[PDB]
Amino acid sequence: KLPPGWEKAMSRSSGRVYYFNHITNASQWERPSGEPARVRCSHLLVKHSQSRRPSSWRQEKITRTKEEALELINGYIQKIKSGEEDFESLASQFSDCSSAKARGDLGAFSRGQMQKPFEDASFALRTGEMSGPVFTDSGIHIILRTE
Numbered sequence: 001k002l003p004p005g006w007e008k009a010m011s012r013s014s015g016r017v018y019y020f021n022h023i024t025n026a027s028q029w030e031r032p033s034g035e036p037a038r039v040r041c042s043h044l045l046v047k048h049s050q051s052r053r054p055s056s057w058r059q060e061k062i063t064r065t066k067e068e069a070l071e072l073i074n075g076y077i078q079k080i081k082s083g084e085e086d087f088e089s090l091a092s093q094f095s096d097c098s099s100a101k102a103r104g105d106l107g108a109f110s111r112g113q114m115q116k117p118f119e120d121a122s123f124a125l126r127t128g129e130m131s132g133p134v135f136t137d138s139g140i141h142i143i144l145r146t147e
């Protein structure tokens with residue numbers, strides 16, 4: 001039927017069908033368009049108190065709750081999708097990953113290198129596509145597949 005991991009859903013507020021991907025957690029109104037050895041991705045990480053290392057270049061002691069970190073992720077996605085802010089801008093300013101200094105870019109990578117939820121989402125993204133909130137032991141990610 002649909003690309004890997006996509007399913008149909010119905011908006012609770014509008015009644016209009018939409019599409020949701022249970023690997024990348026992306027959601028969109030439009031029907032998804034139509035695997036490589038490597039993909040290249042950027043990300044924006046929001047860490048929380050249960051992160052494997054609750055520390056980042058932004059904050060020596062990350063104290064926020066997982067729920068709070070999810071709200072922040074949700075707000076960044078909203079501004080990216082509205083065009084109010086660019087992914088690269090928000091990643092540089094707010095990602096709890098050292099890759100913030102590279103606008104979130106992680107470089108290219110294969111299967112087996114990254115945390116599994118991140119890897120699965122990265123490879124199920126089409127080139128140019130952005131994930132919804134992706135959960136790993138590091139925190140909550142927004143993932144942008146660039147290659």
Ligand SMILES: NCCOc1ccccc1
Binds near residue numbers: 078
């Ligand atoms: N941050 C401004 C308020 O934006 C929203 C955006 C989407 C859903 C609910 C509230």
